[PDB]
Amino acid sequence: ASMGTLAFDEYGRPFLIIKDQDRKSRLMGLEALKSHIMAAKAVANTMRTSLGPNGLDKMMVDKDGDVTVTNDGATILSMMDVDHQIAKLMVELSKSQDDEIGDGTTGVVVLAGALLEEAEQLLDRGIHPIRIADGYEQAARVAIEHLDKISDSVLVDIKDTEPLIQTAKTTLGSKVVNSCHRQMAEIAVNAVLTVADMERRDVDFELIKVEGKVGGRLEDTKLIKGVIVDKDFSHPQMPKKVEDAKIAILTCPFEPPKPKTKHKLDVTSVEDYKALQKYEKEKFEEMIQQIKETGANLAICQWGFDDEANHLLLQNNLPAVRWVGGPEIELIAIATGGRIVPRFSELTAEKLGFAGLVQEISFGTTKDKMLVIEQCKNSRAVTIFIRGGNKMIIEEAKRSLHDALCVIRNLIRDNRVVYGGGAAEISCALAVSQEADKCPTLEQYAMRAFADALEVIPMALSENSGMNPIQTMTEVRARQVKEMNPALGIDCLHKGTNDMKQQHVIETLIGKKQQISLATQMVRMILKIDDIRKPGE
């Protein structure tokens, strides 16, 4: 574009102000604003086709050629190798929506792009970009209040989980896993409700292990109330099933003790050598005897062990797992109700965990084995074991189920619920239009633009569903204003009715509010930029 400085002097002497000013570029003012708006519109029009049940996916290829098929706006924009700084800002915006909510990552981008596209026409008419940003802030406040007004509430109890299942089904309608729609919603709900702190209103996702294994069918995905590990029993002649398992969780390798300090044990005689030999033997025997006397029928170590320990476990009928990772050790403890023991001397019958079933699982013609721990009493940990025909659908299933879990988390944090299908956006657009009518200052135009931008989500849903955008949206808006019903939206699935409260299409109020707030704040930060400086090449 334009250069930093183009004089070189009114006297002919060199004029060097900035380093590599000749290789550097600069864009200033309205042309800079329009470049920003063009970039943002490009990103938003890329994303808008991945919106809604009839939304399509994108195939992302990384540097090393790995393929990722997804409908998740945050994953798409993260996999996208963007160079434009405004596109980077939009990627950050979507990532922020994903961090805070875990859903809406495409709505935020579409809405921000629409806001900037309307600011484009407002700037053409000559309004100051800061005035545009302030009108957008005003309209965003109005829309947030209207969302709080039209919101509904759902019960987050563990007895009737139908509202939560409906919410999760709405969230998962747009993902490839809608083939197992209700199974996935059920397992997301049961997962969060099993592991969720109702009193604190907190949900720790480290306690939800989402594991995937190629093979089987997507319908085989299930919720394990317990843990799955990628290990097998240490000895090949151990039993592959253990019922009523009393579990000893240990972070001590079944090996002779060893000081952490630099140590040298000196052997100075045949008697010293034989004493050392007998010490080693008796250490192994004493370890196994302590584990047996604790009453355990199963051992789980974190640091692996050797041939003598393995065979002694086998002889003493103590199936054992080794080389289990720290996180899985923690999850097994939490699930079985056991305490992690750092050495055998500290092991007691009360520190043991209990699992009604510990089994080794095969996966066809593979030679790889997995260990399932389940039938615990009150497991505060849980595992989601995902199956499918390829790693692409497995990864998409993982991220979609993450979206569902995050949505249930947002419900546990705030039970208020708005109805989707663009209905909430149409209602907020109506409210913003009314407030713009009551506004007599120059921000009227910015607020009308905000309404026209809010209306892009119903239009996008209709377009992706093949309906005519303008016709469908105007008819449902007219119906909303005539018969007061903010649950009137786009019949994306062609169920006949436009009532999203009847179709059980459900969004989170904090989710929608976060969408609107993030889009408005980022659009403000973009409109406030009027000069770009970048290094050459």
Epitope: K149, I150, D152, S153, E483, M484, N485, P486, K501
Partner: nanobody
């Protein structure tokens, strides 16, 4: 949230108007509570105008709903001493949850 305002010659007309925070008044009803008795519904009208009356008094009702201001007017004739009680108004709001019924202070006739 929903603020309700309400306004004997043996036809009496009693009004009930709603204001405040809402976006829809799902149902509007008139209730009566005689002293040492249990509240019953004089009448009630829906948004679609469909009104269902009660059994001890029916056929003489002229309950009318003004949607332009979300208010209602019940014209009752054939007055009787047993109609002498406190007349309560009921307002079903927004979605229609059990925490959405809004009562008035009641008007004694």
């Amino acid at each position: 949230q929903v603020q309700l305002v309400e306004s004997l010659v043996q036809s009496l007309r009693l009004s009930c108007g709603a204001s405040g925070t809402f976006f829809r008044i799902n149902d509007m009803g008139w209730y009566r509570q005689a002293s040492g008795k249990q509240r019953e519904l004089v009448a009630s009208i829906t948004r679609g105008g469909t009104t269902d009356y009660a059994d001890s008094v029916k056929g003489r009702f002229t309950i009318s709903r003004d949607n332009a201001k979300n208010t209602v007017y019940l014209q009752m004739n054939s007055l009787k001493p047993e109609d002498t009680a406190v007349y309560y108004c009921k307002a079903n709001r927004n979605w229609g949850r059990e925490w959405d019924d809004y009562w008035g202070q009641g008007t004694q006739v």
